[PDB]
PDB file of C-alpha atoms and ligand atoms in Angstrom:
ATOM      1  CA  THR A 176       0.000   0.000   0.000  1.00  0.00           C
ATOM      2  CA  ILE A 177       3.082   2.214  -0.237  1.00  0.00           C
ATOM      3  CA  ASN A 178       2.789   5.051  -2.731  1.00  0.00           C
ATOM      4  CA  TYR A 179       6.035   5.179  -4.727  1.00  0.00           C
ATOM      5  CA  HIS A 180       6.739   8.023  -7.141  1.00  0.00           C
ATOM      6  CA  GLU A 181       9.602  10.131  -8.500  1.00  0.00           C
ATOM      7  CA  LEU A 182      10.157  13.895  -8.535  1.00  0.00           C
ATOM      8  CA  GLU A 183      12.293  15.890 -10.947  1.00  0.00           C
ATOM      9  CA  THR A 184      14.257  18.297  -8.765  1.00  0.00           C
ATOM     10  CA  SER A 185      17.179  20.649  -9.248  1.00  0.00           C
ATOM     11  CA  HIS A 186      19.381  17.956  -7.653  1.00  0.00           C
ATOM     12  CA  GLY A 187      18.219  15.169  -9.941  1.00  0.00           C
ATOM     13  CA  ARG A 188      15.362  12.700  -9.932  1.00  0.00           C
ATOM     14  CA  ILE A 189      14.349  11.909  -6.341  1.00  0.00           C
ATOM     15  CA  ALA A 190      12.490   8.719  -5.397  1.00  0.00           C
ATOM     16  CA  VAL A 191       9.732   9.155  -2.806  1.00  0.00           C
ATOM     17  CA  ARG A 192       7.758   6.611  -0.745  1.00  0.00           C
ATOM     18  CA  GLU A 193       4.579   7.657   1.052  1.00  0.00           C
ATOM     19  CA  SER A 194       2.422   5.746   3.510  1.00  0.00           C
ATOM     20  CA  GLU A 195      -1.380   5.749   3.258  1.00  0.00           C
ATOM     21  CA  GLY A 196      -1.935   7.686   6.492  1.00  0.00           C
ATOM     22  CA  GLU A 197      -4.318  10.650   6.551  1.00  0.00           C
ATOM     23  CA  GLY A 198      -2.725  12.228   9.610  1.00  0.00           C
ATOM     24  CA  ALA A 199      -0.004  14.843  10.034  1.00  0.00           C
ATOM     25  CA  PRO A 200       3.053  14.374   7.800  1.00  0.00           C
ATOM     26  CA  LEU A 201       6.353  12.872   8.950  1.00  0.00           C
ATOM     27  CA  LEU A 202       9.466  13.148   6.790  1.00  0.00           C
ATOM     28  CA  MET A 203      11.933  10.320   7.498  1.00  0.00           C
ATOM     29  CA  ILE A 204      15.486  10.894   6.244  1.00  0.00           C
ATOM     30  CA  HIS A 205      17.733   7.856   5.839  1.00  0.00           C
ATOM     31  CA  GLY A 206      21.429   7.616   6.597  1.00  0.00           C
ATOM     32  CA  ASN A 207      24.759   7.351   4.825  1.00  0.00           C
ATOM     33  CA  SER A 208      24.581   4.793   1.975  1.00  0.00           C
ATOM     34  CA  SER A 209      21.052   3.771   2.910  1.00  0.00           C
ATOM     35  CA  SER A 210      17.664   4.556   1.370  1.00  0.00           C
ATOM     36  CA  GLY A 211      14.119   5.344   2.453  1.00  0.00           C
ATOM     37  CA  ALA A 212      13.286   1.673   1.918  1.00  0.00           C
ATOM     38  CA  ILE A 213      15.001   1.069   5.276  1.00  0.00           C
ATOM     39  CA  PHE A 214      11.944   2.617   6.955  1.00  0.00           C
ATOM     40  CA  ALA A 215       9.681  -0.255   5.934  1.00  0.00           C
ATOM     41  CA  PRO A 216       8.571  -0.867   9.533  1.00  0.00           C
ATOM     42  CA  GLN A 217       7.210   2.677   9.842  1.00  0.00           C
ATOM     43  CA  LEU A 218       5.963   2.998   6.257  1.00  0.00           C
ATOM     44  CA  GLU A 219       4.027  -0.278   6.341  1.00  0.00           C
ATOM     45  CA  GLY A 220       3.214  -0.428  10.051  1.00  0.00           C
ATOM     46  CA  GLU A 221       1.050   1.438  12.510  1.00  0.00           C
ATOM     47  CA  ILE A 222       2.961   4.724  12.237  1.00  0.00           C
ATOM     48  CA  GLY A 223       2.399   4.900   8.485  1.00  0.00           C
ATOM     49  CA  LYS A 224      -1.228   3.809   8.827  1.00  0.00           C
ATOM     50  CA  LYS A 225      -2.059   6.816  10.974  1.00  0.00           C
ATOM     51  CA  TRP A 226       0.372   9.490   9.782  1.00  0.00           C
ATOM     52  CA  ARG A 227       1.536  10.493   6.311  1.00  0.00           C
ATOM     53  CA  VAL A 228       5.041   9.046   6.282  1.00  0.00           C
ATOM     54  CA  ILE A 229       7.332  10.344   3.534  1.00  0.00           C
ATOM     55  CA  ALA A 230      10.617   8.499   2.978  1.00  0.00           C
ATOM     56  CA  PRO A 231      12.667   9.814   0.021  1.00  0.00           C
ATOM     57  CA  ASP A 232      16.025   8.664  -1.282  1.00  0.00           C
ATOM     58  CA  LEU A 233      18.832  11.206  -1.061  1.00  0.00           C
ATOM     59  CA  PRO A 234      20.578  12.090  -4.321  1.00  0.00           C
ATOM     60  CA  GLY A 235      23.155   9.367  -5.014  1.00  0.00           C
ATOM     61  CA  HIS A 236      21.187   6.872  -2.891  1.00  0.00           C
ATOM     62  CA  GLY A 237      18.521   4.211  -3.392  1.00  0.00           C
ATOM     63  CA  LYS A 238      16.299   4.758  -6.422  1.00  0.00           C
ATOM     64  CA  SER A 239      17.188   8.434  -6.808  1.00  0.00           C
ATOM     65  CA  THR A 240      19.647   9.404  -9.524  1.00  0.00           C
ATOM     66  CA  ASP A 241      23.170  10.533  -8.750  1.00  0.00           C
ATOM     67  CA  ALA A 242      23.352  14.274  -8.083  1.00  0.00           C
ATOM     68  CA  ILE A 243      23.377  16.536 -11.128  1.00  0.00           C
ATOM     69  CA  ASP A 244      26.125  18.451  -9.278  1.00  0.00           C
ATOM     70  CA  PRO A 245      27.942  16.431  -6.588  1.00  0.00           C
ATOM     71  CA  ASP A 246      29.725  19.605  -5.418  1.00  0.00           C
ATOM     72  CA  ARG A 247      26.367  21.147  -4.546  1.00  0.00           C
ATOM     73  CA  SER A 248      24.395  18.142  -3.360  1.00  0.00           C
ATOM     74  CA  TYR A 249      26.651  15.812  -1.389  1.00  0.00           C
ATOM     75  CA  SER A 250      26.917  17.585   1.961  1.00  0.00           C
ATOM     76  CA  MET A 251      24.739  17.794   5.031  1.00  0.00           C
ATOM     77  CA  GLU A 252      23.557  21.238   3.956  1.00  0.00           C
ATOM     78  CA  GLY A 253      23.142  20.239   0.293  1.00  0.00           C
ATOM     79  CA  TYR A 254      21.000  17.266   1.273  1.00  0.00           C
ATOM     80  CA  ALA A 255      18.963  19.581   3.504  1.00  0.00           C
ATOM     81  CA  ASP A 256      18.398  21.799   0.464  1.00  0.00           C
ATOM     82  CA  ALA A 257      17.285  18.776  -1.566  1.00  0.00           C
ATOM     83  CA  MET A 258      14.866  17.580   1.098  1.00  0.00           C
ATOM     84  CA  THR A 259      13.452  21.085   1.469  1.00  0.00           C
ATOM     85  CA  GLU A 260      12.875  21.234  -2.293  1.00  0.00           C
ATOM     86  CA  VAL A 261      11.183  17.807  -2.180  1.00  0.00           C
ATOM     87  CA  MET A 262       8.822  18.948   0.572  1.00  0.00           C
ATOM     88  CA  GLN A 263       8.055  22.144  -1.379  1.00  0.00           C
ATOM     89  CA  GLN A 264       7.155  20.071  -4.449  1.00  0.00           C
ATOM     90  CA  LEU A 265       4.933  17.848  -2.282  1.00  0.00           C
ATOM     91  CA  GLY A 266       3.261  20.972  -0.889  1.00  0.00           C
ATOM     92  CA  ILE A 267       4.075  20.096   2.725  1.00  0.00           C
ATOM     93  CA  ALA A 268       5.532  22.884   4.872  1.00  0.00           C
ATOM     94  CA  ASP A 269       4.949  21.571   8.387  1.00  0.00           C
ATOM     95  CA  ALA A 270       6.217  18.010   8.580  1.00  0.00           C
ATOM     96  CA  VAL A 271       7.657  16.524  11.711  1.00  0.00           C
ATOM     97  CA  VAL A 272      11.121  15.337  10.667  1.00  0.00           C
ATOM     98  CA  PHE A 273      12.908  12.157  11.725  1.00  0.00           C
ATOM     99  CA  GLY A 274      16.549  11.752  10.731  1.00  0.00           C
ATOM    100  CA  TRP A 275      18.703   8.629  11.035  1.00  0.00           C
ATOM    101  CA  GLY A 276      22.487   9.052  11.228  1.00  0.00           C
ATOM    102  CA  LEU A 277      23.511  11.315   8.356  1.00  0.00           C
ATOM    103  CA  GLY A 278      19.751  11.953   8.064  1.00  0.00           C
ATOM    104  CA  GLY A 279      19.721  13.465  11.550  1.00  0.00           C
ATOM    105  CA  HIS A 280      22.541  15.833  10.612  1.00  0.00           C
ATOM    106  CA  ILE A 281      20.537  16.732   7.511  1.00  0.00           C
ATOM    107  CA  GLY A 282      17.498  17.393   9.709  1.00  0.00           C
ATOM    108  CA  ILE A 283      19.541  19.775  11.842  1.00  0.00           C
ATOM    109  CA  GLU A 284      20.586  21.682   8.686  1.00  0.00           C
ATOM    110  CA  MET A 285      16.921  21.735   7.648  1.00  0.00           C
ATOM    111  CA  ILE A 286      15.878  23.743  10.704  1.00  0.00           C
ATOM    112  CA  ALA A 287      16.992  27.008   9.044  1.00  0.00           C
ATOM    113  CA  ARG A 288      15.547  26.041   5.641  1.00  0.00           C
ATOM    114  CA  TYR A 289      12.207  24.535   6.680  1.00  0.00           C
ATOM    115  CA  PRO A 290      10.858  27.053   9.202  1.00  0.00           C
ATOM    116  CA  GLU A 291       7.502  25.419   9.907  1.00  0.00           C
ATOM    117  CA  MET A 292       9.047  22.074  10.875  1.00  0.00           C
ATOM    118  CA  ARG A 293       6.907  20.888  13.781  1.00  0.00           C
ATOM    119  CA  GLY A 294       9.637  18.853  15.471  1.00  0.00           C
ATOM    120  CA  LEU A 295      12.889  16.999  14.808  1.00  0.00           C
ATOM    121  CA  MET A 296      13.765  13.532  16.094  1.00  0.00           C
ATOM    122  CA  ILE A 297      17.369  12.367  15.634  1.00  0.00           C
ATOM    123  CA  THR A 298      18.572   8.788  15.994  1.00  0.00           C
ATOM    124  CA  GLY A 299      22.184   7.702  15.509  1.00  0.00           C
ATOM    125  CA  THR A 300      23.165  11.366  15.360  1.00  0.00           C
ATOM    126  CA  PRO A 301      25.384  13.297  17.787  1.00  0.00           C
ATOM    127  CA  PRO A 302      25.054  17.045  17.167  1.00  0.00           C
ATOM    128  CA  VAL A 303      28.713  18.030  16.911  1.00  0.00           C
ATOM    129  CA  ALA A 304      30.827  20.934  15.798  1.00  0.00           C
ATOM    130  CA  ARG A 305      33.561  19.774  13.415  1.00  0.00           C
ATOM    131  CA  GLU A 306      36.186  19.823  16.179  1.00  0.00           C
ATOM    132  CA  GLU A 307      34.011  17.506  18.308  1.00  0.00           C
ATOM    133  CA  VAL A 308      33.803  14.550  15.934  1.00  0.00           C
ATOM    134  CA  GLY A 309      35.976  12.352  18.173  1.00  0.00           C
ATOM    135  CA  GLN A 310      33.762  13.151  21.152  1.00  0.00           C
ATOM    136  CA  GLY A 311      30.514  12.401  19.332  1.00  0.00           C
ATOM    137  CA  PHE A 312      31.454   9.249  17.412  1.00  0.00           C
ATOM    138  CA  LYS A 313      33.171   5.975  18.253  1.00  0.00           C
ATOM    139  CA  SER A 314      36.309   5.194  16.226  1.00  0.00           C
ATOM    140  CA  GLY A 315      36.394   1.974  14.219  1.00  0.00           C
ATOM    141  CA  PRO A 316      36.654   0.342  10.781  1.00  0.00           C
ATOM    142  CA  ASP A 317      32.980   0.823   9.894  1.00  0.00           C
ATOM    143  CA  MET A 318      32.993   4.436  11.037  1.00  0.00           C
ATOM    144  CA  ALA A 319      36.033   4.817   8.765  1.00  0.00           C
ATOM    145  CA  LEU A 320      33.992   3.580   5.800  1.00  0.00           C
ATOM    146  CA  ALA A 321      31.558   6.474   6.259  1.00  0.00           C
ATOM    147  CA  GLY A 322      33.806   8.758   4.209  1.00  0.00           C
ATOM    148  CA  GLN A 323      35.408   6.184   1.914  1.00  0.00           C
ATOM    149  CA  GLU A 324      34.530   6.489  -1.759  1.00  0.00           C
ATOM    150  CA  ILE A 325      35.056   2.945  -3.010  1.00  0.00           C
ATOM    151  CA  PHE A 326      33.536  -0.018  -1.150  1.00  0.00           C
ATOM    152  CA  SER A 327      34.638  -3.569  -1.844  1.00  0.00           C
ATOM    153  CA  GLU A 328      32.054  -6.339  -1.544  1.00  0.00           C
ATOM    154  CA  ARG A 329      33.330  -6.967   1.996  1.00  0.00           C
ATOM    155  CA  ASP A 330      33.019  -3.267   2.806  1.00  0.00           C
ATOM    156  CA  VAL A 331      29.402  -3.274   1.622  1.00  0.00           C
ATOM    157  CA  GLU A 332      28.590  -6.190   3.898  1.00  0.00           C
ATOM    158  CA  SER A 333      30.455  -4.897   6.957  1.00  0.00           C
ATOM    159  CA  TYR A 334      28.886  -1.468   6.608  1.00  0.00           C
ATOM    160  CA  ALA A 335      25.380  -2.853   6.067  1.00  0.00           C
ATOM    161  CA  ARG A 336      25.657  -5.176   9.061  1.00  0.00           C
ATOM    162  CA  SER A 337      26.977  -2.532  11.448  1.00  0.00           C
ATOM    163  CA  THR A 338      24.737   0.370  10.422  1.00  0.00           C
ATOM    164  CA  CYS A 339      21.521  -1.643  10.165  1.00  0.00           C
ATOM    165  CA  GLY A 340      21.948  -4.124  13.009  1.00  0.00           C
ATOM    166  CA  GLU A 341      19.826  -7.201  13.610  1.00  0.00           C
ATOM    167  CA  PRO A 342      18.405  -8.637  11.469  1.00  0.00           C
ATOM    168  CA  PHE A 343      20.692  -8.555   8.444  1.00  0.00           C
ATOM    169  CA  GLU A 344      18.871  -8.942   5.132  1.00  0.00           C
ATOM    170  CA  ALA A 345      20.445  -9.451   1.695  1.00  0.00           C
ATOM    171  CA  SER A 346      18.448  -6.515   0.311  1.00  0.00           C
ATOM    172  CA  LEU A 347      20.612  -4.238   2.467  1.00  0.00           C
ATOM    173  CA  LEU A 348      23.667  -5.068   0.347  1.00  0.00           C
ATOM    174  CA  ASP A 349      21.891  -3.805  -2.759  1.00  0.00           C
ATOM    175  CA  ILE A 350      21.092  -0.491  -1.090  1.00  0.00           C
ATOM    176  CA  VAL A 351      24.625   0.118   0.189  1.00  0.00           C
ATOM    177  CA  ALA A 352      26.321  -1.075  -3.019  1.00  0.00           C
ATOM    178  CA  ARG A 353      24.275   1.312  -5.152  1.00  0.00           C
ATOM    179  CA  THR A 354      25.380   4.461  -3.311  1.00  0.00           C
ATOM    180  CA  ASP A 355      27.435   6.931  -5.348  1.00  0.00           C
ATOM    181  CA  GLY A 356      30.698   6.664  -3.403  1.00  0.00           C
ATOM    182  CA  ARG A 357      31.580  10.263  -4.267  1.00  0.00           C
ATOM    183  CA  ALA A 358      28.783  11.218  -1.870  1.00  0.00           C
ATOM    184  CA  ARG A 359      30.551   9.551   1.055  1.00  0.00           C
ATOM    185  CA  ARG A 360      33.881  11.220   0.368  1.00  0.00           C
ATOM    186  CA  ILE A 361      32.568  14.695  -0.344  1.00  0.00           C
ATOM    187  CA  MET A 362      30.045  14.795   2.507  1.00  0.00           C
ATOM    188  CA  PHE A 363      32.726  13.737   4.972  1.00  0.00           C
ATOM    189  CA  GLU A 364      35.267  16.284   3.697  1.00  0.00           C
ATOM    190  CA  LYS A 365      32.760  19.110   3.793  1.00  0.00           C
ATOM    191  CA  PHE A 366      31.769  18.355   7.348  1.00  0.00           C
ATOM    192  CA  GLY A 367      35.464  18.514   8.212  1.00  0.00           C
ATOM    193  CA  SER A 368      35.815  21.810   6.333  1.00  0.00           C
ATOM    194  CA  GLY A 369      33.021  23.416   8.376  1.00  0.00           C
ATOM    195  CA  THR A 370      30.985  24.188   5.289  1.00  0.00           C
ATOM    196  CA  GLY A 371      27.553  24.162   6.942  1.00  0.00           C
ATOM    197  CA  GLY A 372      26.092  25.531  10.152  1.00  0.00           C
ATOM    198  CA  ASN A 373      27.584  24.626  13.530  1.00  0.00           C
ATOM    199  CA  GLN A 374      25.301  21.821  14.645  1.00  0.00           C
ATOM    200  CA  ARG A 375      26.121  22.203  18.331  1.00  0.00           C
ATOM    201  CA  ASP A 376      25.016  25.829  18.257  1.00  0.00           C
ATOM    202  CA  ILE A 377      22.035  25.146  16.015  1.00  0.00           C
ATOM    203  CA  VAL A 378      20.461  22.580  18.353  1.00  0.00           C
ATOM    204  CA  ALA A 379      21.268  24.699  21.425  1.00  0.00           C
ATOM    205  CA  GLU A 380      19.423  27.647  19.900  1.00  0.00           C
ATOM    206  CA  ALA A 381      16.588  25.850  18.099  1.00  0.00           C
ATOM    207  CA  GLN A 382      13.153  26.502  19.615  1.00  0.00           C
ATOM    208  CA  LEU A 383      11.259  23.572  18.076  1.00  0.00           C
ATOM    209  CA  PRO A 384      11.004  20.294  19.997  1.00  0.00           C
ATOM    210  CA  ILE A 385      14.015  18.069  19.363  1.00  0.00           C
ATOM    211  CA  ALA A 386      13.760  14.422  20.373  1.00  0.00           C
ATOM    212  CA  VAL A 387      16.795  12.176  20.775  1.00  0.00           C
ATOM    213  CA  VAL A 388      16.321   8.399  20.631  1.00  0.00           C
ATOM    214  CA  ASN A 389      19.163   5.861  20.404  1.00  0.00           C
ATOM    215  CA  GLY A 390      19.875   2.172  20.829  1.00  0.00           C
ATOM    216  CA  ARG A 391      21.771   1.386  24.025  1.00  0.00           C
ATOM    217  CA  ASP A 392      24.375  -0.643  22.133  1.00  0.00           C
ATOM    218  CA  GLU A 393      25.165   2.083  19.595  1.00  0.00           C
ATOM    219  CA  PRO A 394      28.412   1.155  17.816  1.00  0.00           C
ATOM    220  CA  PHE A 395      28.848   4.600  16.206  1.00  0.00           C
ATOM    221  CA  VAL A 396      27.549   7.197  18.650  1.00  0.00           C
ATOM    222  CA  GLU A 397      28.906   8.142  22.082  1.00  0.00           C
ATOM    223  CA  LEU A 398      25.707   8.115  24.144  1.00  0.00           C
ATOM    224  CA  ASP A 399      27.240   9.812  27.147  1.00  0.00           C
ATOM    225  CA  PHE A 400      28.316  12.743  24.985  1.00  0.00           C
ATOM    226  CA  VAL A 401      24.843  12.907  23.430  1.00  0.00           C
ATOM    227  CA  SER A 402      23.226  12.968  26.874  1.00  0.00           C
ATOM    228  CA  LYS A 403      25.249  16.109  27.645  1.00  0.00           C
ATOM    229  CA  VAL A 404      24.489  18.082  24.470  1.00  0.00           C
ATOM    230  CA  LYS A 405      22.575  21.322  25.081  1.00  0.00           C
ATOM    231  CA  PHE A 406      19.212  21.484  23.300  1.00  0.00           C
ATOM    232  CA  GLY A 407      16.938  24.522  23.185  1.00  0.00           C
ATOM    233  CA  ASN A 408      13.830  22.399  23.673  1.00  0.00           C
ATOM    234  CA  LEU A 409      14.679  18.766  24.453  1.00  0.00           C
ATOM    235  CA  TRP A 410      11.599  16.582  24.083  1.00  0.00           C
ATOM    236  CA  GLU A 411      10.595  15.019  27.421  1.00  0.00           C
ATOM    237  CA  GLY A 412      13.651  16.629  28.988  1.00  0.00           C
ATOM    238  CA  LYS A 413      16.223  13.905  28.313  1.00  0.00           C
ATOM    239  CA  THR A 414      17.843  11.790  25.639  1.00  0.00           C
ATOM    240  CA  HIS A 415      16.181   8.385  25.298  1.00  0.00           C
ATOM    241  CA  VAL A 416      17.822   4.976  25.130  1.00  0.00           C
ATOM    242  CA  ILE A 417      16.303   1.713  23.867  1.00  0.00           C
ATOM    243  CA  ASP A 418      17.668  -1.583  25.184  1.00  0.00           C
ATOM    244  CA  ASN A 419      18.593  -4.381  22.779  1.00  0.00           C
ATOM    245  CA  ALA A 420      19.180  -2.097  19.823  1.00  0.00           C
ATOM    246  CA  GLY A 421      22.159  -0.366  18.253  1.00  0.00           C
ATOM    247  CA  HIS A 422      22.407   2.139  15.424  1.00  0.00           C
ATOM    248  CA  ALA A 423      18.995   1.396  13.907  1.00  0.00           C
ATOM    249  CA  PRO A 424      16.354   0.981  16.647  1.00  0.00           C
ATOM    250  CA  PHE A 425      13.540   1.759  14.183  1.00  0.00           C
ATOM    251  CA  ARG A 426      14.181  -1.687  12.616  1.00  0.00           C
ATOM    252  CA  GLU A 427      15.937  -3.524  15.471  1.00  0.00           C
ATOM    253  CA  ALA A 428      13.305  -2.680  18.098  1.00  0.00           C
ATOM    254  CA  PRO A 429      10.386  -1.339  16.090  1.00  0.00           C
ATOM    255  CA  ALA A 430       7.701  -1.517  18.789  1.00  0.00           C
ATOM    256  CA  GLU A 431       9.726   0.409  21.334  1.00  0.00           C
ATOM    257  CA  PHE A 432      11.011   2.913  18.754  1.00  0.00           C
ATOM    258  CA  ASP A 433       7.502   3.466  17.387  1.00  0.00           C
ATOM    259  CA  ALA A 434       6.200   4.226  20.886  1.00  0.00           C
ATOM    260  CA  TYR A 435       8.605   7.173  21.074  1.00  0.00           C
ATOM    261  CA  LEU A 436       7.981   8.292  17.491  1.00  0.00           C
ATOM    262  CA  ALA A 437       4.177   8.119  17.795  1.00  0.00           C
ATOM    263  CA  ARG A 438       4.202  10.064  21.056  1.00  0.00           C
ATOM    264  CA  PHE A 439       6.559  12.677  19.617  1.00  0.00           C
ATOM    265  CA  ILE A 440       4.356  13.184  16.552  1.00  0.00           C
ATOM    266  CA  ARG A 441       1.328  13.503  18.843  1.00  0.00           C
ATOM    267  CA  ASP A 442       3.093  16.067  21.036  1.00  0.00           C
ATOM    268  CA  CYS A 443       4.391  18.128  18.126  1.00  0.00           C
ATOM    269  CA  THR A 444       1.096  18.276  16.331  1.00  0.00           C
ATOM    270  CA  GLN A 445      -1.441  18.404  19.216  1.00  0.00           C
ATOM    271  CA  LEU A 446       0.180  20.686  21.788  1.00  0.00           C
ATOM    272  CA  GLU A 447       1.101  24.310  21.710  1.00  0.00           C
ATOM    273  CA  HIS A 448       4.627  25.323  21.199  1.00  0.00           C
ATOM    274  CA  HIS A 449       5.717  28.948  21.239  1.00  0.00           C
ATOM    275  CA  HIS A 450       8.641  30.739  19.662  1.00  0.00           C
ATOM    276  CA  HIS A 451       9.481  33.420  22.200  1.00  0.00           C
ATOM    277  CA  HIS A 452      11.930  35.046  19.783  1.00  0.00           C
TER     278      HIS A 452
HETATM  279  C1  LIG B 207      31.551  13.022   9.499  1.00  0.00           C
HETATM  280  C2  LIG B 207      30.686  12.514  10.632  1.00  0.00           C
HETATM  281  C3  LIG B 207      29.869  11.296  10.214  1.00  0.00           C
HETATM  282  C4  LIG B 207      28.891  11.664   9.109  1.00  0.00           C
HETATM  283  C5  LIG B 207      27.498  11.140   9.433  1.00  0.00           C
HETATM  284  C6  LIG B 207      27.371   9.680   9.064  1.00  0.00           C
HETATM  285  O1  LIG B 207      27.811   9.221   8.019  1.00  0.00           O
HETATM  286  N1  LIG B 207      26.746   8.889   9.920  1.00  0.00           N
HETATM  287  C7  LIG B 207      26.660   7.521   9.446  1.00  0.00           C
HETATM  288  C8  LIG B 207      27.106   6.540  10.530  1.00  0.00           C
HETATM  289  C9  LIG B 207      26.147   5.344  10.451  1.00  0.00           C
HETATM  290  O2  LIG B 207      25.049   5.753   9.627  1.00  0.00           O
HETATM  291  C10 LIG B 207      25.273   7.076   9.101  1.00  0.00           C
HETATM  292  O3  LIG B 207      24.432   7.711   8.459  1.00  0.00           O
END
């Protein structure tokens, strides 16, 4: 019952999946070398049955084309531009946004570009200034692949297994193998070059509700660091941790993840929130 269609955008042709839900819209943004197909549990499950879930593929990812201009598109801020253009074409100005990994960093960059965003949930994403990368992320061989252009077959498998967690499915290899490797290299370099907004300052100053939900056994993100990040309006007043999940709780522990996501959507769309400045 998923509505699949493609949009011609200034970045290239962007693939979009939409759930059947009549309720408030939720944009879900996938991570590095993934695709919106990863959000099957939300798209096809109870979240997507109630709310209008939109899960696009970033340029260079999934069923989208490679970027027309990699130098423009393949960066946290460039992806944020692309997603903002997608939402404009879909006529949706006030989505709640969920971002996974790279997708969470993209969501942070979207705050300035998508002013009627009703909330942002980030999973697998430490808001960090460029000089804080070592504090926010755990060092390791799979983390090292995040910025590597060319993946071998073994790289594809290792990266898919670590980023997606249990259960591994063969379809994941196809998603990761497709990714335009230039996107990994350029996005990583540009983060290091400080090309976009300072994410630490952005989340500290943002007035919209920001929710933080992670798997307890995160292999990429330093949860203690994340629990100390200053947020302007931290949803439910703390960062949340789900047992028996790692980098991808939305698929590893869907029931528990969906409880948080559903409640966040309810809060962001049913309660008053004020911008005092
Ligand atoms: C340069 C900092 C890391 C960039 C963000 C990133 O690539 N995060 C990956 C890690 C696992 O899944 C992702 O999307």
